[PDB]
């Protein structure tokens, strides 16, 4: 019962996942929890980085945060 509350959409990145995964691989080291990850998902780009081939995001279906490729996903729209 959080409809436009919720929901942000003002000049946030979106993604449209192309793979489905279920916390499976998990993240090398200790950098955090996996996301569940499913075609159709859009997620937000959270934090970026350069020298990292790993990246985190936030799904709006899960609502949680979680690293994972960019390759392995596809933006929504540019």
């Given at each position: 019962?959080?409809q436009?509350k919720k929901?942000?959409?003002?000049?946030?990145?979106k993604m449209?996942v192309?793979q489905?995964?279920?916390?499976?691989?998990p993240?090398p080291?200790a950098?955090?929890?996996f996301?569940?990850?499913?075609?159709?998902?859009?997620?937000?780009?959270?934090?970026a980085e350069a020298?990292?081939?790993?990246?985190e995001?936030r799904?709006t279906?899960t609502?949680?945060?979680?690293w994972?490729?960019c390759n392995?996903?596809?933006?929504y729209?540019?």
């Amino acid at each position: 019962r959080a409809q436009d509350k919720k929901r942000n959409e003002l000049g946030l990145p979106k993604m449209e996942v192309f793979q489905e995964y279920y916390g499976i691989p998990p993240p090398p080291g200790a950098f955090g929890g996996f996301l569940r990850l499913n075609p159709g998902d859009i997620v937000e780009l959270t934090k970026a980085e350069a020298e990292h081939n790993w990246w985190e995001g936030r799904n709006t279906a899960t609502n949680e945060v979680g690293w994972f490729p960019c390759n392995r996903v596809h933006p929504y729209v540019h």
